[PDB]
Design a protein around this ligand. Sequence first.
Ligand SMILES: Nc1ncnc2c1ncn2[C@H]1C[C@H](O)[C@@H](COP(=O)(O)O)O1
Ligand SMILES: Nc1ncnc2c1ncn2[C@H]1C[C@H](O)[C@@H](COP(=O)(O)O)O1
Ligand SMILES: [Cl-]
Ligand code: NA
Lengths: 61, 520, 61
Amino acid sequence: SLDRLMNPLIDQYLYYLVRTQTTGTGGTQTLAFSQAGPSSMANQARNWVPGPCYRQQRVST
Amino acid sequence: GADGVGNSSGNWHCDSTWLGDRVITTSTRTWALPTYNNHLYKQISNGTSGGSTNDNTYFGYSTPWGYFDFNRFHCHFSPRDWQRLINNNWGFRPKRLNFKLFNIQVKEVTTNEGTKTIANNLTSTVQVFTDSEYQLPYVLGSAHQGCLPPFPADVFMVPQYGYLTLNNGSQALGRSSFYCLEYFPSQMLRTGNNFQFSYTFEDVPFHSSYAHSQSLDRLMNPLIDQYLYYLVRTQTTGTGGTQTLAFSQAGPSSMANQARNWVPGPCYRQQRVSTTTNQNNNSNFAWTGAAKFKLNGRDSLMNPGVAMASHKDDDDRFFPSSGVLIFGKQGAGNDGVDYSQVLITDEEEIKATNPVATEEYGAVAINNQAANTQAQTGLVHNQGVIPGMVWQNRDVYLQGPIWAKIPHTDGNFHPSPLMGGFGLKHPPPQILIKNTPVPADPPLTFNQAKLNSFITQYSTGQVSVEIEWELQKENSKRWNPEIQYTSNYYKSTNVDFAVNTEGVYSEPRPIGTRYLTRNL
Amino acid sequence: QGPIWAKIPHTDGNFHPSPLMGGFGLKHPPPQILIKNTPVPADPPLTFNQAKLNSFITQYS
Ligand SMILES: Nc1ncnc2c1ncn2[C@H]1C[C@H](O)[C@@H](COP(=O)(O)O)O1
Ligand SMILES: Nc1ncnc2c1ncn2[C@H]1C[C@H](O)[C@@H](COP(=O)(O)O)O1
Ligand SMILES: [Cl-]
Ligand code: NA
């Protein structure tokens, strides 16, 4: 798949914004960054993105 | 002798040479290869079931092979060299390279009663081969760790090779393909044995090291007035309020009105976030807020997105949540690190031709104006390419990526890696290495089983990558001094891009490529 | 048991550049000869680590 173009074992040398707010009760804004890993595949940066689309109404057999 | 154990099977070349356009980089590092997966190909999948979401599902395999990656600029460039290149050229691109593996040594480690000893197995071998035909899933260009170290002195571990195949949940499909590296003609080595090859970069466009010194909108002479008119008023000024058509020639004062031949580049809206904590809304919108693209029923984050200006002037604190590259400060933690550790890159240089990441592209009319109905307009958050657009590609950094393999697809548009770099159809082939399994003594009576006992060993050696880059000198007639990357004079306790008191080279900030300015 | 030569500092100017400790003042003296034992890593951990190896076999030449 276009999304799954990277090695599972390795972790990207780049970070992404993982949280805007502290976990738990405090609820105070903070900036947390994590290196996209194998487990967090969706987060990690990619060089290519999917093709174009025009919405098509769905219908079931 | 030609190839013997008491003989250097190669030398150390770590030099940079500048002649004319051509700048040649040469690096050598000392690597170590662990045994991977106990000499076993393992099926690896992450399921829908359990804590993990559906968007993080995958199916693939982890191989007993390691791979050599040099796809990061800092590997071939000294910080000082990066400076010379950035500060005096309007562009550059890779032309050819040369790879070498040598002084291979294989060690066998023994442990008895808490006593550990490491000595040499000379008869032992190490397999190497290049995916010169591109038949193996392309790992590189995914920004994966494990590239040669930035500092020459450091000794590094070789990354483990593994790949992904089509999956539904934790299951594979009929289509999904399983590759066996061993089914590849690979060359074997014993110490005093060396491997090496050469590759030449397909022709690719020079990267832009120049930042525009004219906005796309401001492309016209102030003094003169356009011979064309625009609709300036729909209604008479003052009390009367009766519809009329008034036309004016766009002049110097009315710059915004005047017609233009070119329009800004494409944009995908990126949620804005402020470095200052207080300004941001008090919600965890890291994921919910962020723009994303849905493929095959799974939503993946739009990182790092299309190339767009990080911020409009004086909005320096602002950045796209996912729309810029981020580099950790040295020693930074992998998970949930504080803001201070990270180095957030800034792509404001390209603001002149590219849309701001956090703002709309502009506006379009939503309905026909009517005698009764009022005119309306809607914002454009998502804007695709149209005739007349011009734009700048995303920048590369001293510690950025270099190239990426263009997907073998029926079609694509402006295939320049979104993380920055050169898009190649046939990039530098993946180099695969592996320690040949050396079986532990077999049982005396034949067994149909496959041997599961092996001597424990790892290998080490030097590696050499030499790349020839073609420069493109500056031609500017700019009268005033241009901006340039410099190291501040003012004293400090540590030197920039040096080792600290402990022996830990560190890259204090990301270093862009565009300092020199060129006209539009 | 004295010194023999010394490298004349690369400066815009100087006077009678004979090493003050005695000897021959050379602009291009015998080049410094540098030697080093190549690091030989101790067995690496089985699962890839982004860290730089800190364990080496102890040896001298
Ligand atoms: N870095 C990189 N790699 C590969 N292909 C690229 C790159 N940058 C632009 N392109 C595309 C853009 C055009 O489709 C073509 C060159 O045409 P031109 O008229 O020269 O832009 O190649
Ligand atoms: N040992 C040594 N090394 C380098 N330069 C030296 C040395 N002794 C004298 N000099 C200087 C003195 C003069 O400037 C020049 C030779 O000129 P002359 O007229 O022959 O004295 O060299
Ligand atoms: Cl790091
Ligand atoms: Na595994």
